[PDB]
Amino acid sequence: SATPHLDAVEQTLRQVSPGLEGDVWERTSGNKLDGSAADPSDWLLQTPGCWGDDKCADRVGTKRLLAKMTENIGNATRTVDISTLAPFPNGAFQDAIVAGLKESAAKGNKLKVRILVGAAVIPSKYRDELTAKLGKAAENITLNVASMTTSKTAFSWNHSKILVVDGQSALTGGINSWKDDYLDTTHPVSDVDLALTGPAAGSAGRYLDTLWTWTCQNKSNIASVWFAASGNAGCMPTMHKDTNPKASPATGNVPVIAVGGLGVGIKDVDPKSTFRPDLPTASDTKCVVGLHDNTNADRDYDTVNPEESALRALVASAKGHIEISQQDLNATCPPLPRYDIRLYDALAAKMAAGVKVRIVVSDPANRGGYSQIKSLSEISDTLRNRLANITGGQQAAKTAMCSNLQLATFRSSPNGKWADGHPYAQHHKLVSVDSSTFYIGSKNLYPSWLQDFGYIVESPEAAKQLDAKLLDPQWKYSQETATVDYARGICNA
Numbered sequence: 022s023a024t025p026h027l028d029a030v031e032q033t034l035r036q037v038s039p040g041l042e043g044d045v046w047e048r049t050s051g052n053k054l055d056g057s058a059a060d061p062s063d064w065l066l067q068t069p070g071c072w073g074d075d076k077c078a079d080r081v082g083t084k085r086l087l088a089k090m091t092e093n094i095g096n097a098t099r100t101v102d103i104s105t106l107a108p109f110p111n112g113a114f115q116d117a118i119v120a121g122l123k124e125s126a127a128k129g130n131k132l133k134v135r136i137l138v139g140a141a142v143i144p145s146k147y148r149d150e151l152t153a154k155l156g157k158a159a160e161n162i163t164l165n166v167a168s169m170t171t172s173k174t175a176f177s178w179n180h181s182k183i184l185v186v187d188g189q190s191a192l193t194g195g196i197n198s199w200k201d202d203y204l205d206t207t208h209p210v211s212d213v214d215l216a217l218t219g220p221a222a223g224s225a226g227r228y229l230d231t232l233w234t235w236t237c238q239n240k241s242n243i244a245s246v247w248f249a250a251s252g253n254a255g256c257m258p259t260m261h262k263d264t265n266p267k268a269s270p271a272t273g274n275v276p277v278i279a280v281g282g283l284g285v286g287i288k289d290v291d292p293k294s295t296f297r298p299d300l301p302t303a304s305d306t307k308c309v310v311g312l313h314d315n316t317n318a319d320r321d322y323d324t325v326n327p328e329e330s331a332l333r334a335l336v337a338s339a340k341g342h343i344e345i346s347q348q349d350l351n352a353t354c355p356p357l358p359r360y361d362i363r364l365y366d367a368l369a370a371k372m373a374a375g376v377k378v379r380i381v382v383s384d385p386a387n388r389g390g391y392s393q394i395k396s397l398s399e400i401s402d403t404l405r406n407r408l409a410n411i412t413g414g415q416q417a418a419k420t421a422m423c424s425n426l427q428l429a430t431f432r433s434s435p436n437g438k439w440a441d442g443h444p445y446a447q448h449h450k451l452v453s454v455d456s457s458t459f460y461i462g463s464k465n466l467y468p469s470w471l472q473d474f475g476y477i478v479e480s481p482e483a484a485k486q487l488d489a490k491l492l493d494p495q496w497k498y499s500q501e502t503a504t505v506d507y508a509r510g511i512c513n514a
């Protein structure tokens with residue numbers, strides 16, 4: 022196979038969540054990473070993209086992200102489908118959406134549009150604001166806007182950040198459309214989306230139909246859903262299926278696995294799954310005895326959240342090296358368990374076999390929204406303890422870890438903080454293996470029980486562009502904070 026990593030992941034997903042294939046996860050061929058002729062790596066919609074400069078003067082990343090949002094929407098002929106985490110898009114994010122919608126309306130197109138947010142008056146106000154800003158272009162648009170909560174007790178609601186146009190183009194990643202955190206600030210959050218086209222955009226459209234089908238079903242229950250539409254328009258549970266081809270056109274040669282999760286409160290189990298996991302044991306992840314742990318001790322939860330298993334399978338597929346860039350690997354407990362045991366066990370299995378692991382997280386000084394640990398020791402201790410189970414003791418665990426781990430906090434320039442004195446915040450949900458296959462999406466590696474979505478792309482060419490444009494500049498500046506770095510013999514943990 023040309024695609025050993027996807028092959029492995031796909032075999033896992035089909036055992037975990039067979040009934041969700043097509044809708045919540047899906048393998049496709051024939052896609053394209055959607056970069057420009059001039060800078061073919063600029064499918065990689067990183068922000069801010071001001072490497073080396075503690076003042077972030079030239080934000081080539083941000084500029085390209087907003088331009089690409091506008092360009093994709095402006096090319097719509099039928100549908101625009103947006104999900105994010107509340108608040109609703111504002112600032113220049115909202116401006117980009119408005120500009121795109123006006124452009125499409127001026128090219129003669131009549132559009133259906135869905136905008137869905139997860140959250141803990143807002144929707145109708147956002148609809149009205151958008152409608153006002155569109156002017157005459159609003160006459161062309163059938164709009165649905167909604168906020169939703171699927172479980173109050175599991176803190177479950179939409180967390181995906183997706184923009185799909187005509188079922189053909191898709192932008193997704195970790196970026197919320199929040200002007201204060203990303204744009205109008207001298208300490209912008211560092212994050213990444215990707216832009217693709219092809220059948221894998223269809224996959225995202227079918228994922229969004231899954232969420233909207235639940236949302237429209239629950240639209241009269243105020244505790245669950247707040248819905249607003251333009252004119253006399255109804256809720257559109259299946260806009261994608263109804264408006265776009267099931268057979269999405271091919272655009273390139275890139276193979277992709279789309280994968281998401283349904284969180285808690287949409288669907289409790291995949292009734293088709295016969296998955297029978299070995300559930301790891303004995304860790305110190307559950308800080309309190311009362312907590313129900315969906316991440317580590319709920320088989321049914323896995324079957325409706327294939328993304329957790331997909332990310333653990335991506336790690337397990339690595340033959341040489343794994344790079345992980347996250348806000349955090351660990352969650353705040355309560356209400357969540359501190360870590361995903363199976364993920365740390367998969368990383369430990371890899372280091373024990375000499376596969377190199379790099380983890381870069383957000384500076385704990387953020388705490389200090391954008392960090393959930395006090396110290397990198399909270400990561401290294403856990404990896405060491407899980408390594409001890411398979412290397413025969415704590416000493417052999419520490420040696421394996423020091424010979425195979427790079428663990429650090431993020432910086433984007435030579436300075437320990439931004440020039441304005443605020444720590445760098447990082448929010449990527451990024452995993453790359455073997456300079457071959459990578460995940461970009463909204464699903465954090467720390468325990469979380471939300472509706473999420475992302476893509477796993479197997480393309481050494483694209484993975485090399487990801488190295489040059491993101492992971493290499495990240496390590497260049499971030500390596501100075503490392504507590505463990507096998508490449509320089511640092512072992513302070």
Ligand code: WO5
Binds near residue numbers: 106180
């Ligand atoms: O949008 W998210 O965990 O990646 O709530 O900060």
